[PDB]
Every structure is written in C-alpha cells, then in structure tokens.
Amino acid sequence: VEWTPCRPGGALCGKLAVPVDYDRPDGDVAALALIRFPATGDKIGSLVINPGGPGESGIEAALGVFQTLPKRVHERFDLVGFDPRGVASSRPAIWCNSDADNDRLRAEPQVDYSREGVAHIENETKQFVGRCVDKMGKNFLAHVGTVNVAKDLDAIRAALGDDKLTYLGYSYGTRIGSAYAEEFPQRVRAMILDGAVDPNADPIEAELRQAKGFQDAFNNYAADCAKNAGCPLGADPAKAVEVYHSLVDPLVDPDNPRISRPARTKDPRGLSYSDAIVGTIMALYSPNLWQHLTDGLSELVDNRGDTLLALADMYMRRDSHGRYNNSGDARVAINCVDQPPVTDRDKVIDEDRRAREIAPFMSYGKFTGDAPLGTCAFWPVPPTSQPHAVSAPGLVPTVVVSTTHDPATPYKAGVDLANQLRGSLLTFDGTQHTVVFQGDSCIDEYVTAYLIGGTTPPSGAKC
C-alpha cells in the first residue's frame, strides 16, 4: 500500500487490492480505499474503525471521529478508516438505482398493503434486483458479505504493519467485529463494539425489537417535547401517536392510498408520507436531532414539510444537488448475503400484524391481511453467512457498549453479544444509537483505558 495526501488534518490515503473471490485469488480483484491520521506521540498501532450501516463509509467516518477523538488516543494510535468492498470509494462500488429511481420511490406514500399495492411494491423490488445484476454481475454481488469483509480486515491489519488488530465498530460494524473474531481471534489486540448486532438473532424477532425500539424512542421524544412550550404533539404524551397521525396522515389521499398529497416545501419534491416517516426515524437516532423533529412537526401544522424532507435526505444520503451516494444500494446488497432471507409469506404477513401493534407511529391505517416481501426474498445470489451464536473461545476480553433505549440496535442485543463474546458490557443510559467518542467523557475514559492499557470496565459499569 503506497500512501499519499488527500484532496483536513495530517491525513494520508491509499488503496489496497484484495481478491473479489477468496477462492480465486488470481481472478477478479477489488481495491479498498483507506484513510490514515498519523499518531502524534508514541505509536502502539492503528485504530481501525467502522461506522456501520452497512453501506456507510469508514473514510468519511474517520474524518468525523478525528474531531471528537480523545487526545490520549490520538497520541497513541493512527486513526484508520476504510471503505468496505462495494462501498463508497472502494472499487467496484455497488450501484443499482439512478438518482431518479430513488426520488421516484420516495415520492410514493408506500403505504398501500392491499393485494394491488403489494404487487406494485413487489414489482418495484424485482426491477431493483434486476438493476443490481445488470450493473454489478452475479459474481461481485455474491461476495460483498461480511464474511469477506472480515477477510479484508485481516489483509488491512497486515498492510498497516500491525501484528494484532485494534478495532472500533458501530452498529453493523459490530457484525464485522464478531466475524473477524471468529476467523482471526489470534490477531485481535482489542475491540470496542458500540450498538451491538447479535448474529444469533432470528431476523423477524430482531426487526420487531427494532420496531419496539423506535416506538419507545418516539415515546421518550414525545414526553420530552410535552414539557416544552408549543409542543406540536400536544401536552399529553399518551395521545402523541394520534396527534402524530393527525399531522402525517393528511399526506395520503384518504380515498386512494397510492396518491400522495405532499406538504408544501421550497424544494420541488414536497414532503411525501414515506419521507415524513423516514424523517422521524432519522431524528430518533439522536436527541441532538429532536429539535429538528419538533421543527419538522410544527411545519406540518402549517402544511409545510421542509425540515422533515431534509431529515429524510440525511438518512438517504441525498446531497443538495440531488445526488445520492451508494450507501442505500450497498446497504441492501450486503444485508441480503449476511443471512437467509425470509421467503414465507405468512410469517411476513404476521410480522406486519405485530409491528402495527408495537410501533403504531409508523403504521398507517389498519392491518390489511397482506404485506410485501423484503428485497432479500428476491436476491439472485445465496447468503454467505447464517444466524448462529458467536463462538471464539480464545478471544481477548472485548468491550461491548450498549445504550438502554437504543432504537436501532437495542440494549438486549448488546447484552447477548457480550455474553457470546464473554467480554465486558458497558451501559449508557440514554435514547440514541451509539455514544462512543460522541461527547460523553465517562464512556470515553473507559474506552481510552481499555484501548491503551487493556483494562476492562468492571461488571455493572454504567454511564
């Protein structure tokens, strides 16, 4: 790996070729992009990070992490971000949708689960899968899975001159962590995993727990808001969901649910129902975004939707010129090969029945007796991994950071992952997705002490 400065720090960038298929290392070849912020003191090794997603860029993540990095850590480690195979700047990058394909889906209310509606959604899914294959080919798509990201991580580890790996992973990055721990445990120096994914979970029960997560985050937000002047959800938090629907449901024609009635915005798109929901979901990632959600809902009282559209744009990674990065396309592709997809219609129909009851704020109208299959039920290449309990007996102790009311990756997953790893659980009291190197000085002391001196938080540690 030949290093070079970038086009924002003391940063160096580089590429590293890995085989696309790890059984055909003389066959097709991918190149991973790396960024590197040199250590300013006595160097221990490289701190390698992953932001999660999947489809999120680690290079763009390292630039953000750099600003909030404890001085002691920055003294002792290179901060290294990478882009996983198929993601952001790595080549080839997963592409399925044009920018116009994305806007077109986002203009639909996506709320009609009658048979016609479900056929329409399922038809759009098929054209999507087709567009993936046409642009990427069945070979590359077969190997974007985490099991192969883990193999690149060890190629990366070795390419930076470290005997063991020091690793920080958020969210989906947790799944990369435990995968690397299973296949290269003798190469793990240290590991922080914030916002856990449990590779042993049943996919449907996890989603329902995630729905519950977000309903619960919504509850918390709404209750906070209720104490504030002029709260758009009303002063009585037990009626928030209904008020919330009184604000978002008019965005759908009440006589034909395929017809969007979008709120006025300076942007030409306006605000669709599906964007309103996605905007809400985005804000519930972090209390830093609650002010924006409140602004967003306030605008809706006046039939405006500028702030919710911006929040949905943030989530979808659409910039001000209408260009999308590949995080959405890559997200789907990588998720589809990480585990067997649900193909049983009945168990998908029942999941919709349950989610409507668990997360009413997300659900429109009533249960219809029908629901669409997820994109992955139509994936042309098979999963490269399967739900199982993490078993990596000789792994060093690791730290798993879990937030009590995390909506994306709930507290319980964190607990369970820590058990399988038989490492330390560190608890954050809060309502957000992840917390490490994000301001909180208590979390950061524990993590800095672990990273440098290998010292783990004591059983029951909470912040």
From Swiss-Prot:
The gene is hip1. Serine protease that promotes tuberculosis (TB) pathogenesis by promoting the processing and the extracellular release of the M.tuberculosis (Mtb) heat-shock protein GroEL2. Hip1-dependent cleavage of multimeric GroEL2 results in release of cleaved monomeric GroEL2 into the extracellular milieu. Conversion of multimeric GroEL2 into monomeric GroEL2 is likely to be a mechanism for regulating GroEL2 functions during Mtb pathogenesis. One of its GO terms (molecular function) is carboxylesterase activity. Pfam families: Abhydrolase_1. It is a lipid-anchor. The active site region is accessed through a large opening that suggests that the enzyme has endopeptidase activity rather than exopeptidase activity. It comes from Mycobacterium tuberculosis (strain ATCC 25618 / H37Rv). This is Serine protease Hip1. GO terms for biological process: post-translational protein modification. It comes from the Bacteria. Disulfide bonds join C6-C13, C96-C132, C225-C231, C336-C376, C442-C463. GO terms for cellular component: cell envelope; cytosol; extracellular region; plasma membrane. Interacts with GroEL2. It is found in: Cell envelope; Cell membrane. It is an enzyme of class 3 (hydrolase). Its EC number is 3.4.21.-.
